[PDB]
Amino acid sequence: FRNQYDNDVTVWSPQGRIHQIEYAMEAVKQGSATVGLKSKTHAVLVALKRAQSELAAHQKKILHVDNHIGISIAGLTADARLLCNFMRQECLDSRFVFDRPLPVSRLVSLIGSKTQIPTQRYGRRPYGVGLLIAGYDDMGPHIFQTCPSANYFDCRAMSIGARSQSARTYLERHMSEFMECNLNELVKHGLRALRETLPAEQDLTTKNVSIGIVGKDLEFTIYDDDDVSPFLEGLEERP
Amino acid sequence: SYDRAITVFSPDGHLFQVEYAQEAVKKGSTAVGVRGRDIVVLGVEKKSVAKLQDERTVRKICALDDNVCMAFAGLTADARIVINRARVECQSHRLTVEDPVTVEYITRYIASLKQRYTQSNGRRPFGISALIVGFDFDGTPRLYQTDPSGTYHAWKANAIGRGAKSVREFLEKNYTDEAIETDDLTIKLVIKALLEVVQSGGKNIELAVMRRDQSLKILNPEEIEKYVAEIEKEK
Amino acid sequence: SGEARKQVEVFRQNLFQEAEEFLYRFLPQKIIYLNQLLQEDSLNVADLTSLRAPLDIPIPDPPHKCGFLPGNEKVLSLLALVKPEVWTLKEKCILVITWIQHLIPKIEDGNDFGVAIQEKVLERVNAVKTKVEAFQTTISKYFSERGDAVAKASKETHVMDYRALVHERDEAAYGELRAMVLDLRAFYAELYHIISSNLEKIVNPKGEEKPSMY
Amino acid sequence: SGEARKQVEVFRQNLFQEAEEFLYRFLPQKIIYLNQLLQEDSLNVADLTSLRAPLDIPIPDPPKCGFLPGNEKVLSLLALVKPEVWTLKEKCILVITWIQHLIPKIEDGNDFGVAIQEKVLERVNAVKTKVEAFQTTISKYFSERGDAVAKASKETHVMDYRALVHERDEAAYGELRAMVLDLRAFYAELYHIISSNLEKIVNPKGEEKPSMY
Amino acid sequence: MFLTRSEYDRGVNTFSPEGRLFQVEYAIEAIKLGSTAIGIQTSEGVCLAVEKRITSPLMEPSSIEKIVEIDAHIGCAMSGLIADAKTLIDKARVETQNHWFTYNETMTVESVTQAVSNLALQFGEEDADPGAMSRPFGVALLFGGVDEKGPQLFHMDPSGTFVQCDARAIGSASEGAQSSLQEVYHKSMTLKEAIKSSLIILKQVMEEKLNATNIELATVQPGQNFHMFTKEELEEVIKDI
Amino acid sequence: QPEAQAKVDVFREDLCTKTENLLGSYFPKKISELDAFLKEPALNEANLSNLKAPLDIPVPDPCGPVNCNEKIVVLLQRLKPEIKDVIEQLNLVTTWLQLQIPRIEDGNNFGVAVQEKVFELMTSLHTKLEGFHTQISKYFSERGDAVTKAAKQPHVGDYRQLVHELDEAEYRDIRLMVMEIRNAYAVLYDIILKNFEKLKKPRGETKGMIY
Amino acid sequence: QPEAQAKVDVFREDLCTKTENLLGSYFPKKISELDAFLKEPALNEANLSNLKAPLDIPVPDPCGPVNCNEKIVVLLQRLKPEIKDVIEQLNLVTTWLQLQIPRIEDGNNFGVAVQEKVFELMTSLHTKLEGFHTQISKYFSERGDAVTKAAKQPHVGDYRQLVHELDEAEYRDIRLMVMEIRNAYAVLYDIILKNFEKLKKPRG
Amino acid sequence: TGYDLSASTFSPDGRVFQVEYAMKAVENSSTAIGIRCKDGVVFGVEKLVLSKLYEEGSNKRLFNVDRHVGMAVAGLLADARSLADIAREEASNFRSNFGYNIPLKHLADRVAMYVHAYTLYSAVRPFGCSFMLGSYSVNDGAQLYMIDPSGVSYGYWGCAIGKARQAAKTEIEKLQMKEMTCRDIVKEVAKIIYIVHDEVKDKAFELELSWVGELTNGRHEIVPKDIREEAEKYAKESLK
Amino acid sequence: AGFDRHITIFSPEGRLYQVEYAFKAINQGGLTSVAVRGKDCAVIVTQKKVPDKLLDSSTVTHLFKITENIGCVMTGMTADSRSQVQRARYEAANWKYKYGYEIPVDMLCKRIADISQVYTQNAEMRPLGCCMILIGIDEEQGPQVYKCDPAGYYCGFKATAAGVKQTESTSFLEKKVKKKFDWTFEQTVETAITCLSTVLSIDFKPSEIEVGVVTVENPKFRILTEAEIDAHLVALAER
């Protein structure tokens, strides 16, 4: 049967696996894909937004935590809104207390600690949002992904979301080129990688793509529907 | 499956425990309210004397405050808690805003208390539906009804409790501006309607009227006898 | 292949149109026709003695193969009216089962309530199928049983219980046919009611995709 | 007496070795050989008319039968199938004994492996019943054909009885073909379940009490 | 072949194999139990319309209140459980007022939706506060108002997600009404056309024949504040249909 | 052994290819073939009395070869291959799903469950078709026994009727089997196609490492 | 009653003593014997055609005693004693375990549960071995019926084949039973030995 | 059987299965080894590279719990990072109140008690991480301590955690570590890490090595890349 | 059933099965501990099994010092044992602080035992599965040996044992007390070692046994050094 061992985060399975945490991890797959890549001078997040209906506007997939840090959500939007608020307050706190932009890595550690507590204690469900966090700090451009499981990873590039393996595949092959890339080239590489996730009939449009760029001189900026047009125009056609 | 906890929502989005509490109200004694132009009349059936039981203790119709009166159908004990809590609020509003509570404010307060009970597991919804009758500062008569769910609606006339469906049909047909024209006529309409559902005659109906500034008056059994007689004679 | 989906989709669409039509036309018409067959005096015979059919076997008395002993004609004409009906119902019931089976949705962890409505309706359609199939078996059983009794009664002319058995077997079929025409009529009726009452859930089990929470 | 455990343990090690050889040798070889019998022209005859075999019973005409032989084509094919049916049955039994010998001491927890073994046992049991039945059908075919022929000869007039003998033969041919795919599929399904889950099947529980207690 | 086991549906705070959090999904289904409400946002203003669903003639029509004013600039049409709506309309009314007190300005429609949404998100037991409903809220609100960016209509769902919608229908006939809305909506339509179009769609979806009593209609054109068409005004528009 | 690895690999490749052919090509075509077959008049006979075949058995106050009902034997010839084919295809689909079941693990049971559930319906179709096969065998034996009984006892009229009834019943049943065979074919496609992603890849893509 | 207490105690002492003998000494010995028997050539005959034995029924263009297949009967003579021995030994273990089952109490049930699980398996072997016994009985009746049918109806060639087939099947079945009997004895040692502490002392 | 569902429950035979189930979690993780030699303690972790995309020198499984002590973890990483935080907090407190660097034996005990608490209550699951702590202080000496999910803490001359724990222990056993010096051990740890790694099952690994000892002046520190590179070469050559 | 599975529920025959299950856990450890009280000395001996050569022998001990003059041997789950020792050490100090004199051994067992009853009566926690035997010298009553079990029973014994062979060990000790000869320090230690050895059939070497003694002449609990253990062991073999 094995229906048992899956009811709560507090029950270890006979083989060492906490099933609810794994089930939570599945939530990220349900969400629309997002791709994050880094260059020696800039970090970029690109997202494929989805719309309930033609009349409805596309959802926000990229959110600004701070001038130096921004996140893209894949998964339940609610968990993301809650985590983002925690992150924003933690960043605001550092500026008031130490007058320094919070090191991006430190923030991810804090998101991990908050995220882990639901996993070990009966009660709150594990957060089911998967987050890609991008920021430029003194150490440099940084791209980190956070699983619904609290584990976090530092990545040269990553795509989280539905059909994200295809994007990871493109990113791995063209990865070396990214480090020395110019900003236009880096966003262009990313837009192509998310294109792979899209169904063959669908095409990247100004409406479904959101680009967020943070860099030594650029505060995190989410280029949106009409401002993605410069980055999108240079792109070619589906392979 | 989806009926054991108030918090759980059924596939199809029905919260079953709240609906079940509404079933409890149906098991309770009938109550009818008619909003006459100058009088609001609230009438409730009395189950039985039991011979050895004093009737003063059992009172379905109660006055929340000078201008607001309430009748209830449902678990009797819950009503006593809600009635008491409403009375504290009526007096507390008078303390806070110096002004007598409007009928609707009391209805909203009573409703919120009930909703609060439905919202969290660990508390059972109060199994009472109430008819709150009152006259506002403008002096317009107002009749409102509340349900275990916490929905409040204003009804020109309504019946809650067992047989409510039958009386409400009777009221829909019988109620007219002409019927509410005379204060006696209004009392007659409620008595006639309760008669439809009451197994016995006038012996089993307790009725009360609140006039524009007068306090709630529970009609004496004799006064009820006179009214039933006029109705029976006219029949 | 999209083309393979298309070929099944063509069949699925045809079944839907037939099911809708069968529900709004054949099922109501059949209820009326069957009620008439029941109303007819032929299936309403007051005395079973009239159904008794001649068994021309000579009895043994103190001082050859019997002449042809025909089947109870009255029962046979009734059987001839019933046999088409048993098959129309079986086929129409089968059309409905396929319609529901096709409509069942992709298996999912939850929101499987619509599937449940489909399952309970299928359980009724299955129960009806077994009962109706049995009716067809009974017709053959009667012929074999009546035949065996006729054979035994001629072979041992002395035993009269065998003669009674033939009369009883005929009596039972008349009684059974009356019940069977009643059941087919009832079955069309129950099927129409379960499907009509629960049509929405059966047609669209899981409903509109949940607005994005993702 | 430890002597008894040794005898069983020697039996277990023999069974373990036999199973490993069967999985990596007898099982793969049989899968290829059976597919060849399946793709052999004999089991793929397009027109069943070829299978029809002579029935020497005189038709009744207006004014005892000679020896009636079995359909040789079916008999030759059956003669090939009977060894194959038995070899699968024998091998299935050896595998079942090995899983059974490897089930561990019953305990309240750490029973995931025991459950894997039970899932595998469920499949082996399903296969055993199906394969045993194949053996039964072979015998039934001869008996049913034999009675049918007897009935046809005893009552020459009935012609459906003659059709029945022919129909029984056609079915056996269709069944033999289905049986060979089934045996091949069975060897294959067994190889896949045992191979995929061998680690857990061999060592279901392992040691989970360390310094905790 | 039916696998209807479920068993992960009951109890929020449980993720189904496939990570679907079914209780929240079921709550979204509840809004279908509610009366249909349709909102069209046009440059001239945002119009909101709802079906009252009056059970008995004796019930006073005014009391049913499926369109309410959060503040002069923003109004809300709600479909779903009436009671949980009352709490959400209240958080909104306090938050608009709190913004006036703290910042002496009028909240944009989007911020007000974010504010009510934040309350809705709390159903997950996100906070340790005792006074938070465990169940996801069962109401969907369409919030329409004239702000700095001009007429805007945002739709909120029991999940707590909110999005701007040029036209949306929430309720029993939302599927189908939305389809019709898609065909009729053109960005250029004036509010007068939208009011007529929305009422045409409602007449089709509603079981009862449209009458001034059965419908509630409101508009928030940029110069004017939230306005609820009175029976006389409603009679004029329905007559045009 | 390498020969072993290759031998298993060939079987695995062929099975996966054959299933794609059955689902992509054979199943759509079969539905069409059956659909034309059912539309054809041979299995659309309004009056079963027409199906009746003359019995020459003499009526009492010497029996010639009593032929079978040609109309039914003709229909059987068309139906019998179909019953066997659907059985073969059901064996193929069961092995295909079985070879796609992952190594047992505590988690990711959904999908392994969908696979097992799909197997159950398919095994059930297999049982229903073997049940149909049994019915076909019974027709020849029962009609034959009936004819024999009628011949042995010319006096019993009912036995003569039984022969006609068994024949009339078979045509009706045989038409139903064809309709059912089409249904089984279509449902198999719907069950697999609708739930294909889980059936083909039950565990799902690798998703990070908690450990 | 004191004499009765001696009578019951003596049965209890004997049951416990006999069981240790079966597991400690008889079961190892039987597994060796069954191993020796399977190795022997009579039950390892590659060509089942050799097993086929002549039927003298005259072919149709008066039948003498048609003897039974000596090879099968010879094998049955070796197999049938073994089948019976295990059925008896299984009773000894089934009774022994039941005596070890303790007074029913609300808890500490695991142990009673282990005893029940082992009991179910031993009972399951009993059903299989009884099934083997039924099969042995059927062969004699079925083979006789087939020879009789063939002799009664010489015209039918299939009946002659059926007799040959029944014999072939029996040899295979008997061979399998020897293998199953060995396995059934061996599994019994594994279940009882592995769970012996709980079976002997379920409560703890 | 409902005995295994919670840690509050005890099985009829006396075993708390949920703790044992948690111990199985560590076996899922990759092997990590710590060897204590006379000069100091060297820890090594084979960190599987799941994807080329992940940055090197990240996803670290070796954490510094205080200036003088280092922690190597195996098991669910999330719990480990959280346990590391508990340890760091405990170390800070010992310095804040008692005014000196925490003795490692005490640190292990305090963290173990925290880990054990989870074992008793039913609200919280046992932690799924097994970790090793090591420190060198001139007064205390070199100390390696390993904590199981149960909360059992013991001092190990050499220790291994993770999927290949049994295999690694056999290799570690033939080392005569007490006599050996810290620099030599780093090569040896690598040899063992390479031997245990299964190339077929695990595509590739990056060895992360850390050490504390007289050479590091009692500060746990990541081994300098020159030393690590030399060791990785020694290991491949030995693997032959 | 279901009568077991929660400590709070009582069986239909009032047996609180979960507490009984805990006593089983002490045995699961596989180690036995014997304590014997002499005229002037109290000794606790326990079997020390080191599973791996790598483990440092010094770290593994079941003998702990609750206070300078009270010593305890805890048998059962190792982790639970350490937890109880800390509570005992805290309780022992808290007595000195509040009452100004060293806790009497009986009172330490009583406090520790009473804590165990709370676990036995409250639903969330599990009875700790360990048994603690305390040895101390009280000036008024001479040497004292007390055992507290997971139930909360706190009896004091002239001699006692805990672990897998407790029943056998008790029988051996019972025979020796019945033939009372009184016990000198040497005899008290010798009796303990002979008992553990005979029940286990081990024929112990100095490394396998840990022996702790409290004497009136030197009241402080001391864990004997391997050499000291060897001396007693050698004498036992010699005679």
Could you characterize the architecture of this molecule?
- Chain A has seven helices and ten strands.
- Chain A is of the alpha+beta class.
- In chain A, the strands form two sheets. In chain A, strands 8-1-2-9-10 form a five-stranded antiparallel sheet. Chain A has a five-stranded antiparallel sheet with strand order 3-4-5-6-7.
- With 214 residues, chain C is mainly α.
- Chain C has one domain (1-214).
- The two termini of chain C are 29 Å apart.
- Chain F is mostly helical and 211 residues long.
- Chain F has one domain.
- In chain F, α3 packs antiparallel against α4 and α4 packs antiparallel against α5 (157-194).
- By secondary structure, chain H is α+β, with helices and mostly antiparallel strands.
- Chain H has one domain (1-240).
- Chain H has helices spanning 17-28, 77-98, 104-120, 165-173, 182-196, 225-239, and strands spanning 32-36, 40-48, 62-64, 69-75, 129-137, 141-147, 153-155, 158-161, 205-213, 221-222.
- In chain H, α2 (77-98) packs across α3 (104-120) and α5 (182-196) crosses α6.
- Chain H is globular, with a radius of gyration of 18 Å.
- The termini of chain H are far apart.
- The C-F interface holds C 1, 3-5, 7-8, 11-12, 65-71, 76, 83-84, 87, 90-91, 94, 97-98, 101-102, 104-107, 109, 136, 139-140, 143-144, 146-147, 150-151, 154 and F 23-25, 27-28, 31-32, 35, 48, 59-61, 110, 114, 117, 146, 149, 153-159, 161-162, 165-166, 168-169, 172-173, 175-176, 179-180, 182-183, 186-187, 189-190, 193-195, 198.
List the helices and strands and how they pair.
The structure is cut from a larger assembly and holds 9 protein chains of 7 kinds.
Chain C: H1 2-39, H2 48-51, H3 73-103, H4 113-155, H5 161-197, H6 199-203
Chain F: H1 2-39, H2 48-51, H3 70-99, H4 109-152, H5 157-194, H6 196-200
Helix pairs in contact in F: 1-3, 1-5, 3-4, 3-5, 4-5
Chain H: H1 17-28, E1 32-36, E2 40-48, E3 62-64, E4 69-75, H2 77-98, H3 104-120, E5 129-137, E6 141-147, E7 153-155, E8 158-161, H4 165-173, H5 182-196, E9 205-213, E10 221-222, H6 225-239
Antiparallel strand pairs in H: 1-2, 1-8, 2-9, 3-4, 4-5, 5-6, 6-7, 9-10
Helix pairs in contact in H: 2-3, 4-5, 5-6
PDB class: hydrolase
Keywords: proteasome, 20S, PA28
Entry title: Human PA28-20S (PA28-4a3b)
List the chains of the largest interface with their residue counts. Answer: C-F, 41 and 46 residues
Counted beta strands of chain I = 9
Oligomer: part of a larger assembly
Sheet with most strands of chain F: none
Helix content of chain I: 25-40%
Note the beta-strand portion of chain I: 15-25%
Radius of gyration of chain I: 18 Å
How would you sum up the global shape of chain F?
Answer: elongated
**Structural class by helix and strand composition of chain I:** alpha+beta
Which secondary-structure class do the elements of chain F indicate?
mainly alpha
Protein name (chain E): Proteasome subunit alpha type-5
Family (chain E): Belongs to the peptidase T1A family.
Keywords (chain E): Acetylation, Cytoplasm, Glycoprotein, Nucleus, Phosphoprotein, Proteasome
Subcellular location (chain E): Cytoplasm; Nucleus
